[PDB]
């Protein structure tokens, strides 16, 4: 009842406009909502609970497939029920092929500790940040993302370096990073996207955030990230991606081409142009697809990793059956 109306409000907020802007807020709200779902709805066996979770997660994902934090948090919860059921009652590999009613409290405590560990991902990333920045380095970022801004603005407490931020047109939110970071004395620079390659030779390394990392190591980021990665590969400069663990989602690029997110073309082309708006077709995607071959490293709350290892993290977070959801 009350939980149902809260779920409906959450779905409507996702459909219209994200209230809690930070992805961490999305993860915390999704986990809390799943907590009241588990506590309130009645179930005898784990199967009906799993299918109810499948239905609710399907509804929430269908509300807005552009962002996948809700989806992979739901998948993590489903794996939590699977693990708890296997523990209280009793991974695909060649070894497997050759060889061969009180869990509610355990589920609740698992979700609680998941929230506790999710709280400190930013702090862990900041703690390990200092080992990848040396004095008088040149760093370039794209758009706005709180992870990398915390990264740099804490790693500059003991080091001095230069930072270049390219505005992510049309949503010129790189200016926000520039202002916030220059309010910490970092000697930053504000730049357009069209100049990326023009300056890319004189950059030591490039650190970027992301919105979602796929299974193959390819990621979905803000528009223009693919061009930056291509320039990096051309100049062979290392590329660092700062992404917490919950931004890892088990889908794959070729899925119905509902991958990008197209917004109103008002930002790209103002409505004041007039007559020419009929014969002209305008596209304003907000996300770009970066292949895994252009990525050098992954920094998460657990440490450093290579893209070629990303698949393993998939097996430790999501059961293969719950990919389709």
């Amino acid at each position: 009842s009350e939980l149902s109306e809260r779920i409906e409000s959450f779905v409507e907020t996702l459909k219209r406009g994200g209230g809690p802007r930070s992805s961490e807020e999305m993860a915390r709200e999704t986990l809390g909502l799943l907590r009241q779902i588990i506590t309130d709805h009645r179930w005898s066996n784990a199967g009906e609970l799993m299918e109810l979770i499948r239905r609710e997660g399907r509804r929430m994902t269908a509300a807005q497939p552009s962002e996948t934090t809700v989806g992979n948090m739901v998948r993590r919860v489903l794996k939590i029920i699977r693990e708890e059921y296997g523990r209280l009652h009793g991974q695909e590999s060649l070894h497997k092929l050759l060889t061969s009613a009180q869990l509610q409290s355990n589920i609740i405590e698992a979700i609680n500790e998941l929230l506790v560990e999710l709280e400190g991902t930013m702090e862990n990333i900041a703690a390990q940040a200092l080992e990848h920045i040396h004095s008088n380095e040149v760093i370039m970022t794209i758009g706005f993302s709180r992870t990398v801004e915390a990264f740099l603005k804490e790693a500059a407490r003991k080091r001095k370096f230069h930072v270049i931020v390219a505005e992510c047109a049309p949503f010129c939110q790189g200016h926000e990073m520039a202002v916030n970071l220059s309010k910490a004395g970092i000697e930053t620079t504000v730049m357009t996207d069209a100049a990326i390659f023009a300056v890319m030779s004189r950059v030591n390394k490039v650190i970027i955030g992301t919105k979602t990392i796929l299974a193959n190591g390819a990621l979905r980021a803000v528009t223009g990230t693919h061009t930056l990665a291509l320039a990096a590969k051309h100049h062979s400069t290392p590329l660092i991606v700062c992404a917490p663990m919950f931004k890892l989602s088990p889908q794959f690029p070729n899925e119905e081409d509902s991958f990008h997110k197209f917004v109103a073309p008002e930002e790209v082309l103002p409505f004041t142009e007039g007559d020419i708006l009929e014969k002209v077709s305008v596209h304003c995607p907000v996300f770009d697809y970066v292949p895994p071959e252009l990525i050098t490293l992954f920094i998460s709350n657990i440490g450093g990793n290579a893209p070629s290892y990303i698949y393993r993290l998939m097996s430790e977070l999501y059961h293969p059956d719950d990919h389709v959801l």
Binding site: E92, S93, L94, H95, L97, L98, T99, S100, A215, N216, G217, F252, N254, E255, P292, P307, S308, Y309, I310, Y311, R312, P320
Partner: protein
């Protein structure tokens, strides 16, 4: 049985169902030999099995047979560790082998279901030679009501590309046969490349027909994706360093006519196996986990 029912039985299994791969037939023949072992010793059992390995490898020396034999050897060792008495462990070997055959008989369907999503409408696929996995994947894609074109090379040493082109045009798919030398000419039209594999090496590279490497190299020049479809049992702990490092017992005998070459994992985009969709680096992990 002793050295005569082996080869005849293997060929009978291959011929009665010609749409079934050599490795599966070899594994089934090894299981049949295990059934009619009439000997009571685990060490002698494994000695007879490893002798059967190369008496089967004498014919159809493709890498898949060796990979299946190594998998069978590892399976029988694993089982022995689990238990203790040959007497009791014999029936469990038999049942585990039956379940293994049942699981591997669905590899084609699982791979097709997993991989049919990767074909776009209006796409242009490129194929080297005949491979039943590719045919099954394209059948699944057709069953999804998709529209695309298929270019296939002719595989000059034995014209099996024409055979697969016939089998595919039987399914009402627009296909085009091209010379083995025309690959560089053709792929600019191709949207992506899908190939089979006769064996997967430690790092992630493949061991396939003679032309495959060329395509892969040209693919890397054209920045086009390169997908390989292969079952789980096509894994082997071989690591060639270059083209001449793969054992010569696989190159020749089906003025210098090899038959099989090696493709480095760096040119491979994704591996489509019954274990799922893997990066090239994943395979080693799995193959490491088998021996730890």
């Amino acid at each position: 049985m002793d050295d005569k029912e082996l080869i005849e039985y293997f060929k009978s299994q291959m011929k009665e169902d010609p749409d079934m791969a050599s490795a599966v037939a070899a594994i089934r023949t090894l299981l049949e030999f295990l059934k009619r072992d009439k000997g009571e010793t685990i060490q002698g059992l494994r000695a007879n099995l490893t002798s059967a390995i190369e008496t089967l490898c004498g014919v159809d020396s493709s890498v898949a047979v060796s990979s299946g034999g190594e998998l069978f050897l590892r399976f029988i060792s694993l089982a022995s560790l689990e238990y203790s008495d040959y007497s009791k462990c014999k029936k469990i070997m038999i049942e585990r082998g039956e379940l293994f055959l049942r699981r591997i008989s669905l590899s084609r369907n699982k791979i097709a279901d997993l991989c049919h999503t990767f074909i776009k409408d209006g796409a242009t696929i490129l194929t080297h030679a005949y491979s039943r996995v590719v045919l099954r994947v394209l059948e699944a894609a057709v069953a999804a009501k998709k529209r695309f074109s298929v270019y296939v090379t002719e595989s000059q040493p034995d014209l099996s590309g024409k055979k697969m082109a016939k089998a595919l045009c039987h399914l009402n798919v627009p296909v085009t046969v091209v010379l083995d030398a025309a690959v560089g000419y053709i792929m600019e039209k191709a949207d992506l490349v899908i190939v089979g594999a006769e064996g997967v090496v430690e790092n992630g590279g493949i061991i396939n027909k003679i032309g495959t490497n060329q395509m892969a190299v040209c693919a890397k020049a054209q920045n086009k994706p390169f997908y390989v479809v292969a079952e789980s049992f096509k894994f082997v702990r071989l690591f060639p360093l270059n083209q001449q490092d793969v054992p010569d017992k696989f190159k020749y005998k089906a003025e210098e006519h090899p038959w099989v070459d090696y493709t480095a994992p760096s040119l491979i985009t994704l591996l489509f196996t019954d274990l799922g969709v893997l990066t090239p680096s994943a395979v080693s992990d799995e193959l490491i986990k088998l021996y730890l």
